[PDB]
Amino acid sequence: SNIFKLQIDELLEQVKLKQKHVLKVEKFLHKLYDILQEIPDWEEKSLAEVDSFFKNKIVSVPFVDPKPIPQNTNYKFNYKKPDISLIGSFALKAGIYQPNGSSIDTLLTMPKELFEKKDFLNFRCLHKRSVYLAYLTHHLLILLKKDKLDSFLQLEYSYFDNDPLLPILRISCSKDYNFYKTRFSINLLIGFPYKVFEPKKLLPNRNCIRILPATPLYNFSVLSSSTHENYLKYLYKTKKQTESFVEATVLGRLWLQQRGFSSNMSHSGSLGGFGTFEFTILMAALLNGGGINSNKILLHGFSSYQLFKGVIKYLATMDLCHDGHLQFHSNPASKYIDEGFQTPTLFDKSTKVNILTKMTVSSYQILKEYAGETLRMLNNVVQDQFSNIFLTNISRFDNLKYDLCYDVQLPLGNNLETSLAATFGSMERVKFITLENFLAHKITNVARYALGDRIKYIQIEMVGQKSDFPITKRKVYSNTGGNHFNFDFVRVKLIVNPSECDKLVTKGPAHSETMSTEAAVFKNFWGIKSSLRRFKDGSITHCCVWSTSSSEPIISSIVNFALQKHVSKKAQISNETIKKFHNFLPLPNLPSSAKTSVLNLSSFFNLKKSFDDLYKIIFQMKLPLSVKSILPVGSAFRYTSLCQPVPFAYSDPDFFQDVILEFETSPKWPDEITSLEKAKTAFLLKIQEELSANSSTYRSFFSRDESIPYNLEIVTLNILTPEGYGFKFRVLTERDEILYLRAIANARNELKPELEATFLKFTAKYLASVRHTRTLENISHSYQFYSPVVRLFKRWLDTHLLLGHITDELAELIAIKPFVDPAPYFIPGSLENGFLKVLKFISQWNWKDDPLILDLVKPESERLTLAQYKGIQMNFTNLRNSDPNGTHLQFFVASKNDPSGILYSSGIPLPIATRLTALAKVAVNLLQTHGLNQQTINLLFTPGLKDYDFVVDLRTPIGLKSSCGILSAPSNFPENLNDLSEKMDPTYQLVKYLNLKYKNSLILSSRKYIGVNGGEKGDKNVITGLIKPLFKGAHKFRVNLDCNVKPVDDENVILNKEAIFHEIAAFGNDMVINFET
């Protein structure tokens, strides 16, 4: 806890405002108060006279729609001196330094004599306040000129908290009274006195706009406008009673800001409505109670950490919107009521004001989710979570936050179509003051109702909405809007639910003899798409059926049809970013591949069923030693193969799937390595023999394996299964492991580091490989989108010639981090969100000082405990102590399977390791500079190929795409098994050998999969090379030069680039086509 407490303190002092700017602004607005005191009074005026008085003035009043017309504006207008007061965080001195900038709120209270009792009806109080602001602006402007401050002051209106009904004057300083360096914003709040209108008439259930439907938004606006100073007083008392209030306040505003949460209005569409004063007033409400028994949940003696923890726990578990609401008294212990108002509610009985009125239903669930997931991190003791909670901005990119994003282009956008304007109607103007508020609500209901369980959370954002407008104009002007609608377009953003996002049929109410109300809303909503169906279970239910596709999800069709039918038949709904990522995944050459969903693993299940057929065969077969078990350890068995398995598609690199065969422990195993492995081939040689006799439909052949260095007797049995799948079998025995340990012990001290590397690769294939499949295969299910993203992630590495150096397992461990460790984000639920999350992590991963350790466990045992956690951390420090720069090791990937952390990340050259981070960084920068769009994605998946010193192009004699099982094809294995090599790509093996010979001088790389990244016909592959700095320049000649060079002087040589090109050309034979140096 002490580590966190000190971490709190460092954050406060780092962000703490510099007190000098407080004096600077305090010098200014203190003088601004004097300017206000100069402003003269005014007489009673009708709308006709004030219009004439403001007719020729540069100032224009910000009348709120509907503007007062001569008939209904019979009430007069007058101005008098207000009571100037200072309000806001600056009043509480809980303010901070914000690089984007903060604001200072000053309230000018109208004298009560300017108000009648029934002025809260039909925007009566609204319009007189509007002219009151205008009269201030006129006189303030001229007085600003007289004092000569106008040179560096810019004045404009703005809407308070993006509330269209409360325009305010906003004062800034452009580059002695110049406060531009302070970066603070004086906002003049024109609010009403306390208790001018009976608050009981202003309750949410009541109405104040005659046309009856309630007006919660307007009732809050005037009532909240009349209740400012009281909440101000209410917060100081708490500030005195508990010493850690301001500290608790500043912790939340971080957490609000990093999640992109603000006090601004949410019905418009922007995510927000929970700001600092919502955050603080929840404290004060909780500090005097909050429980169902009205017991205190927070105590005044609590520290900043405890105060912050209580509200996060309070908000996470108690519901304030649907079932339950909280009541408190600002002026009486706060009590949690079980009844709910179906909207976020924090009633204040003293003021009769609901503080969560601006808080929307949809945003509230996302708030409740964010607090809960932080509470889990807050309770976490194994891992430090300070940086994630407070020092990580998730609000930068919408795609990373939100699984799917859809932009809806509304028709006739210099006003909305007559039909769409007609839908607004008069009743909804009363409910929702602006069409933006209503239209956003319209999208949410139809989108929420249409998708239902397919999604977790939905957000509707009015892109291009402005809140500030010049002094000369009465309302905000949008270029598309034309003073009609303050937005450019609507973006529909979702948090999908992977479990049922791809359901083919949307279940509905059951059939009944009388058509029920839920069935009524059912059949009407989907219309012709609605109908009645029966199932195997015998249930008769109204349901609608969709069609799966490999290019877009089912959610694409639902929103397009749902919005068009209800919102507007002319709406254009498009999400191309999903479609490009879906297409980049290879399309398998199976029946109905196009209609198959990306979440369907049908190809994978078919593979193991064929293995199960072979599984039964091997066991009943009689051998000298009984079979202990046969363990599949393949990529397709763990659902990570880049291209899905295809029958008879033997050109695929992953076609032959490795399997581990182990027999009963025996004391007769050879004690020598070569006899042991040759004895293994003898056992496999039997397995080939009577398999051929008993099961002739299975075909078989033998191949040699050289992955393990210096163990050249390894022979693997390749079985060509009749269903059309290939399997590679290698035998595992207990004596094999200890013999390697024997070699390390006997090896000379200089040779021991080499031998342990050989042991490292052995355990990576035989021992650790078995565990890797077991966890990932089980862990893959609930993480439905992990399989597509790791496949697409693997595709991205191959395009950039990085898979040749990165082992397959490392790409999986890096790709699973957003799933096992989603904080501060959520678990990926879409292909693009997961993939961009993987790229984001690699961009910001500092692998030299920060280790990667993963808890390969299911979502909330095998979780890493404190003892295991500190042990792995101890390991990373020890390795980095010997290898600070990270030349030998770059990526430290560890888990329960791999506590050492070097098992799957050893042998990667330092150059390549920097490419993964360097490419990831630029990709993130590209997304920032240019938003996610078709052009950007095409860049993300195309290789530059220019930085490489020399580039070699290759073409295979035949196209391999068809034989790889990729739909832009063999139906049986060749009669002669020699013919398999004729239809395969050797460039991966060509590069592997050439690196080792030129290990000291060159680094060659190539595309492992040629059918996917080799063009239309899948024959074009490229070998790209790099000359190390040392051999790039001339060197003195020595026996240990270990490089192909040319003499220049009697003791000087230089690299032989031309012959290496010839050496590659002869080694490539006819495949090589061109050389670019």
Binding site: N846, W847, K848, N885, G886, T887, Q890, L910, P911, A913, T914, R915, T917, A918, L919, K921, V922, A923, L926, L939, L940, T942, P943, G944, L945, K946, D947, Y948, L1026, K1028, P1029
Partner: peptide, 14 residues
């Protein structure tokens, strides 16, 4: 166009 990153052999990008 393409994403091209200057090759780094001193781990300086990190």
């Amino acid at each position: 166009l393409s994403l091209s990153a200057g090759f780094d052999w001193t781990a300086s990008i990190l």
